[PDB]
Write a protein that binds this ligand. Structure first.
Ligand SMILES: [Cl-]
Ligand SMILES: [Cl-]
Ligand SMILES: [Cl-]
Lengths: 215, 210
């Protein structure tokens, strides 16, 4: 059993402190690692420590920022990560590490459930809204809803009267900490000059409501 | 870097292999481990010491390595196997654990479907504000894995690109989007931009011009 505990939220350039609890002992005679995973991305090993070393071995790409430690009497394995940025937003896992230098075998046989840590420079901000305009049977038009925080936003078309062929895409999160999304309606090609299309955008956290004609 | 194919897939009942290609400083001298991460759980150890199974891992999973490259094989594919797989090995030069780039295993599903790609130029309105956001929308593709690359005058773009993870649509195909955030001056000073979407080894591109 391994249990991570974290702060949930940390401000940019602050220090992230996590803890991993190892009930049932065995902390002293083992290696222990921190591993993380940004949303939508791959695993990254941060480093390991021995339960009594207290030797440590860190990912060189994070070295100046990382401190691992072991409190044998509280059975706690800890990570400090200084000067965080949005790149450090990830799920953080602790894992028991089997490490035999002699055979070059390093692997993680027991994992915690992991804790999400979110680093955000973003404050509430309302979006800009721009039109997305272009033999095929269909054409696509839409609205770009740019640079808002936080989620969510809603988008309907023609005041809710147009529902068929509507696709609102999940938002992207940019390195700025702000989101953008797009909503597009797929329409018969011949309908292009014979009908009008207005996206109705609502971003409630910023009291933002915009109607935009797309032509 | 341990290089895995982003997407491996086959019908239930079939067999698949997932490659993991390293270098002599890692896979060549080290034992290889594999991890299974069902969505959206923690990873679990599937294979350790290159070919060994922890208790409670089925004999349908099997591992080997040859030189600088490792492989995980799965037989009798079952819907529960659909998941991300990561290989891992110690690198004795860098003194670090290196995870592979990860493979989504898809248990098919429905037929393969190539993405429909729409690339929008920046609007006149955003341009008057001295900005140009290009918007590349990718929909109805299956398996739900794609690589997006942008070109500026045919040149690879390595700055200002942001692309979502793929998300399951109601029809169980997937959607994604990619945004290239520019100033109006960059847009106006190029002759073309393209969004190139690679899915299952084929590429679908769209191009816009100022
Ligand atoms: Cl099984
Ligand atoms: Cl660039
Ligand atoms: Cl259908």
């Amino acid at each position: 059993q391994l249990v991570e505990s974290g702060p949930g939220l940390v401000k940019p350039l602050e220090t992230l402190s996590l803890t991993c609890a190892v009930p049932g002992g065995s902390i002293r005679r083992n290696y222990w690692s921190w591993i993380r995973q940004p949303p939508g991305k791959g695993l990254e090993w941060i480093g390991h420590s021995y339960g009594s070393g207290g030797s440590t071995n860190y990912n060189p790409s994070l070295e100046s920022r990382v401190t691992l430690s072991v409190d044998t009497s509280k059975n706690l394995f800890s990570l400090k990560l200084t000067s965080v940025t949005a790149a450090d937003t990830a799920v953080y896992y602790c894992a028991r590490t089997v490490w035999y230098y002699t055979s070059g075998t390093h692997y993680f046989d027991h994992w915690g459930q992991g804790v999400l840590v979110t680093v955000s420079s973003a404050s509430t901000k309302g979006p800009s809204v721009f039109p997305l305009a272009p033999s095929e049977s269909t054409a696509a038009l839409g609205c770009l809803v740019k640079d808002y925080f936080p989620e969510p936003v809603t988008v309907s078309w023609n005041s809710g009267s147009l529902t068929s062929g509507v696709h609102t895409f999940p938002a992207v999160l940019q390195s700025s900490g702000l989101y953008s999304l797009s909503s597009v309606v797929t329409v018969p090609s011949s309908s292009l000059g014979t009908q009008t299309y207005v996206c109705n955008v609502n971003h409630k956290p910023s009291n933002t409501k915009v109607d935009k004609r797309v032509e | 870097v341990l290089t895995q194919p982003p997407s491996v897939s086959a019908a239930p009942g079939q067999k698949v292999t997932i490659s993991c290609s390293g270098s002599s400083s890692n896979i060549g001298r080290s034992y290889v481990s594999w991890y299974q991460q069902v969505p959206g759980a923690a990873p679990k150890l599937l294979i350790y010491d290159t070919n060994k199974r922890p208790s409670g891992v089925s004999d349908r999973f099997s591992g080997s390595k040859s030189g600088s490259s490792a492989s995980l094989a799965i037989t009798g594919l079952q819907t529960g196997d659909e998941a991300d797989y990561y290989c891992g090995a110690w690198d004795g030069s860098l003194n670090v654990h290196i995870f592979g780039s990860g493979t989504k295993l898809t248990v098919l599903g429905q037929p393969k479907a190539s993405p429909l790609v729409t690339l929008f130029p920046p609007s006149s309105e955003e341009l008057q504000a001295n900005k140009a956001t290009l918007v590349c929308l990718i929909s109805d593709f299956y398996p739900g894995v794609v690589k997006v690359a942008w070109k500026a005058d045919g040149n690879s773009v390595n700055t200002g690109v942001e692309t979502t993870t793929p998300s399951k649509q109601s029809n169980n195909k997937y959607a994604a989007s990619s945004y290239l955030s520019l100033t109006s001056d960059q847009w106006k000073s190029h002759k073309s931009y393209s969004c190139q979407v690679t899915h299952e080894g084929s590429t679908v591109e769209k191009t816009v011009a100022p």
